[PDB]
């Protein structure tokens, strides 16, 4: 198969883990559970050129920089630097993360992602985002909540790595299910869950 170790780096409370979870499960973890160390998540995409896999190393933004965490960056092939649109303090740290990345992996596709663009009180604006112009980066506004350009970073990274500018995602190679199987031993238990399922409201905003 094809694997592209991707490194997801950004200040604490920006949405890296939420971004990865929304990509691999579709849920929306609205609780802030700080990621400790690094978490490896495989995302399998299908494109017109076949299947690809991104091993997203979601790193912790609460840690400091330096060599103590260079183990994350070893043999990296693409990076996503994520900053929070509704916080300028998080945007001020993008240069530090870029420096830390390029210290270990010199030339790699790096994508800047401005998260949380669905909130009305927006501090960082499209005019003030000037860092990506000095370097050679691609800047994208994303929102893991409303699903706004939430797959553009992966598409751009795949385009730059595979080498096909006209690459785009195809639907899926989904085939019929194998067969219906049930276990009467636990069947009753399943029914109980339904008895509780109707007693809770959907997370509707």
């Amino acid at each position: 198969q094809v694997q592209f170790k991707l490194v997801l780096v950004g200040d604490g409370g920006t949405g890296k883990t939420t971004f990865v979870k929304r990509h691999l499960t579709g849920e929306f973890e609205k609780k802030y559970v700080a990621t400790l160390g690094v978490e490896v998540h495989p995302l399998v995409f299908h494109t017109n050129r076949g299947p690809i896999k991104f091993n997203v190393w979601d790193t912790a933004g609460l840690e400091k920089f330096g060599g103590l965490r260079d183990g994350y960056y070893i043999q990296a092939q693409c990076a996503i630097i994520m900053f929070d649109v509704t916080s300028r303090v998080t945007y001020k740290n993008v240069p530090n993360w870029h420096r830390d990345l390029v210290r270990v992996c010199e030339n790699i596709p790096i994508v800047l992602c401005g998260n949380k663009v669905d909130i009305k009180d927006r501090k960082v604006k499209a005019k003030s985002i000037v860092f990506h112009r000095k370097k050679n980066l691609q800047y994208y506004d994303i929102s893991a909540k409303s699903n706004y350009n939430f797959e553009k970073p992966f598409l751009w990274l795949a385009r730059k790595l595979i080498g096909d500018p006209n690459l785009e995602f195809v639907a899926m190679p989904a085939l019929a299910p194998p067969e219906v199987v049930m276990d009467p031993a636990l069947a009753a238990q399943y029914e109980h869950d339904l008895e509780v399922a109707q007693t809770t409201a959907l997370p509707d905003e």
Binding site: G13, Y32, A34, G66
Partner: protein, 517 residues
């Protein structure tokens, strides 16, 4: 910035030549095993009096944490512990255990922990649970500073920390020495509203706070109102840092309400707080109402408009000890900046405000005619005698002209220089073996043309003498050159002249060659 000098004085006050702080900062030790921490434990044991322990920039595993806690068990005079960023790289199954072990070690030791710093450690609710045991215990009744900057606690962590602080205060009051927190630094933890309200409730119990930092907590107005109400109770507040939150307009009004009743605030950082030019007016009124001892006030990037900026400037000017005002980033017109500067200079300060740098609103004759280095080469070996034959050597003037033309294209390239030198040798060999040819006349004309000597009829001199000097240097070493013209060349080459100092190397080499003979 008075803050920098205050920090410098504080750091100076706690430097000792012996029996003081023990540090491991900037060593990147990966204490991944009990044995791997042998040096650290051995150094900790061999310390007479311990009053501070820094473990910054390291990686403490579970086993190393247990060993270090066992070592700390002995130290009973410990009073501070800066543990900033000592878990870089550890997973979720290894932080709470290490933190609990360290807390138990300190508790059994019987320390006092005048300061407890855990900044830059990725804790979350798990780490908060880990060190809650230490926070509640008797080891933190005397605690005076609790820095948790960038711990990434969150809502649950904030609630747990607030509960722990309340329980610690209750126990301390029961004992007889109530907890008196002075500095609380919990920034960049996303305490958005539940954590912020819980910590405001915790503050309301403790009336001893002096500094409170909560930058970049994603707090909105519903929590900021409660935080302001909690601040109102504390009358000794000195620094109120809430940079990069979202007050909108209700939050700013609530903050002005409390600022009215506080008479010792010295620093007010509200940058990136989206005050929106109405809360700016409210804060201006509050500060005008009386707020001495104010030294700093930051409202940068609050989207303030021109009129509100002028109002706040006018209100602030009345302050006596003002030392810094920031309004950069506000939507002030270009004329607005000039008006603000004029208003400020109307007072004594006139320079207190920070820079407003971001605002919004057959061919031998042909060659001889124009000699060139490449044209000489094209003649090949024929150039050795073609130049000699063509030139009329009866009259020394033509010999000198030919010599100068040949040597003008002289270059250090090996092939060119050899051709030039052999051509010169042939030309002079044919010239010097002529009875009707006076050598002194040739030398005088050569000196005249090079500009080293003057003439009855002023013949215009040449620009560069490098080529002629190199050719002369080569010629002096040949046999046909008379041994009587050496003194004349020596005298007129040692003769000072501007045209000669341009080419110092050729002149020096020629002089050395002349002094050889």
């Amino acid at each position: 910035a008075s803050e920098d000098i205050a920090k410098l004085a504080e750091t100076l006050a706690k430097t000792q030549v012996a029996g003081g702080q023990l540090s491991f900062k900037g060593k990147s030790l990966k204490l991944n095993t009990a044995e791997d921490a042998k040096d650290v434990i051995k150094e900790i044991e061999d310390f007479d009096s311990l009053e501070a322990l820094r473990l910054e920039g390291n990686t403490v595993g579970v086993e190393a944490a247990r060993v270090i806690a066992k070592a700390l068990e002995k130290k009973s005079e410990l009073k501070r512990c800066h543990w900033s960023d000592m878990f870089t790289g550890r997973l979720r199954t290894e932080i709470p255990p290490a933190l609990i072990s360290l807390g138990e070690g300190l508790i059994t030791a019987g320390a006092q922990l005048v300061e407890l710093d855990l900044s830059d450690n990725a804790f979350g609710p798990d780490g908060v649970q880990g060190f809650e045991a230490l926070l509640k215990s008797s080891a933190c009744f005397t605690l005076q500073e609790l820095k948790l900057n960038n711990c990434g606690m969150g809502i649950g962590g904030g609630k747990i920390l607030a509960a722990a602080l309340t329980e610690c205060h209750r126990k301390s009051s029961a004992q007889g020495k109530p907890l008196a927190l002075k500095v609380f630094v919990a920034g960049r933890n996303r305490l958005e509203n539940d954590g912020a309200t819980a910590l405001a409730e915790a503050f309301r119990v403790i009336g001893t706070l002096e500094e409170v930092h909560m930058p970049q907590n994603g707090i909105n107005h519903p929590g900021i109102t409660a935080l302001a109400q909690a601040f109102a109770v504390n009358p000794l507040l000195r620094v109120i840092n809430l940079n990069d939150n979202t007050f909108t307009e209700k939050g700013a009004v609530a903050m002005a309400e409390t600022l009215k009743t506080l008479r010792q605030v010295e620093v007010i950082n509200f940058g990136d707080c989206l005050v929106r030019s109405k809360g700016a007016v409210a804060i201006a009124d509050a500060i005008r109402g009386g707020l001495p001892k104010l030294k700093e006030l930051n409202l940068s990037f609050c989207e303030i408009k021109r009129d509100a900026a002028l109002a706040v400037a006018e209100a602030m000017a009345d302050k006596a000890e003002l030392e810094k005002l920031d309004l950069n980033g506000n939507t002030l017109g270009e004329e607005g900046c000039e008006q603000l500067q004029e208003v400020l200079e109307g007072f004594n300060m006139a320079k207190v405000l920070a820079s407003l740098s971001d605002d919004e609103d057959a061919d031998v004759s042909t060659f001889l005619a124009f000699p060139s280095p490449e044209k000489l080469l094209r003649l090949g070996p024929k150039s050795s005698v073609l130049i000699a034959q063509q030139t009329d050597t009866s009259d020394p003037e033509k010999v000198v002209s030919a010599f100068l033309k040949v040597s003008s294209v002289f270059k250090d390239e090996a092939t060119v220089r050899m051709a030039v030198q052999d051509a010169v040798d042939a030309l002079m060999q044919k010239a010097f073996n002529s009875s009707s040819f006076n050598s002194n006349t040739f030398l005088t004309r050569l000196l005249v043309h090079m500009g080293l000597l003057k003439s009855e009829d002023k013949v215009k001199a040449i620009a560069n003498l490098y080529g002629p000097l190199m050719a002369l240097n080569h010629m002096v070493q040949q046999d046909y050159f008379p041994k009587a013209l050496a003194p004349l060349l020596l005298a007129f080459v040692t003769k000072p002249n501007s045209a000669l100092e341009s080419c110092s190397f050729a002149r020096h080499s020629l002089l050395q060659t002349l002094y050889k003979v």
